[PDB]
Amino acid sequence: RTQTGNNTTVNIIISTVDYLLRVQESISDFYWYYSGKDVIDEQGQRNFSKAIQVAKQVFNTLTEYIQGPCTGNQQSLAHSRLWDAVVGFLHVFAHMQMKLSQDSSQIELLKELMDLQKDMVVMLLSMLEGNVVNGTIGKQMVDMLVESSNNVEMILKFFDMFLKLKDLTSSDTFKEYDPDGKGVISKRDFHKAMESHKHYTQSETEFLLSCAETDENETLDYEEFVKRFHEPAKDIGFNVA
Structure with missing residues (x-):
């Protein structure tokens, strides 16, 4: 910042x-x-x-x-x-x-x-x-x-909308929608889930559908979804808080 001894000081x-x-x-x-x-x-x-x-x-x-x-x-x-x-x-x-x-x-x-x-x-x-x-x-x-x-x-809002995702994917109704541990749940069931839990509004729901990648079977891997979004959210949002 200040070079005390020098004749001229440059502020790096x-x-x-x-x-x-x-x-x-x-x-x-x-x-x-x-x-x-x-x-x-x-x-x-x-x-x-x-x-x-x-x-x-x-x-x-x-x-x-x-x-x-x-x-x-x-x-x-x-x-x-x-x-x-x-x-x-x-x-x-x-x-x-x-x-x-x-x-x-x-x-x-x-x-x-x-x-x-x-x-x-x-x-x-x-x-x-x-x-x-x-x-x-x-x-x-x-x-x-x-x-x-x-x-x-x-x-x-972007951070909170993904922080609630972990709770929604850990709810019981999500588990009975996806009784198998493979982690593949259909688009239909996923959109039913985010409306039955009703954590989100319709706009947030459709935005998460847009941000959720569907396969040919129309099932998404919700666990890779949550590790993709919740973890960066839980990281940055804590510093913001």
Whole structure:
């Protein structure tokens, strides 16, 4: 942050967040390009993978800058342009989480993205290390949340809608719908289940049908379904909470 002895000081902490803002702008633009299109090409998926790796590394670097509370680094990052990068990533995460989940060819892309999301939340938690009551970092972070109100709400609803999935798949009526331990349950029975348990509304129910992959037998593997969605949800949502 500050080279005390040197005649001239260069703020590596601020330069890192400047690069983070540039890469998040690039990622947001590439998302906007691949937004209206029905499916993402292999080239697009590879470019997303590379950009997500770069952003993940930058987030890890910032987290290592700020952990072991370095109050100077925390204040510099608070007054820097980190909040704009975070609010851009929040929009990207809120929209990919609903776009990629429906399709089945972007499982690895969704995993990479929800790992980047978890690292961003870890960086935010490390920002809130050694917090004081009515501090400046808390105020700036609440301002960022208010600015990104809709995206945070979408992400939270997306997380809760999959956190209830574990309870629904552990209910007794689900077990008597799927008496066999193989784990294959028909689309018809699954949609009967999510309505009889009535945890979800009709929109949530049809969205989970869309996000559930059906085979030729029209039975889905609910256990791989839950390990695919609940575990990343249980991971990221705990940090958000």
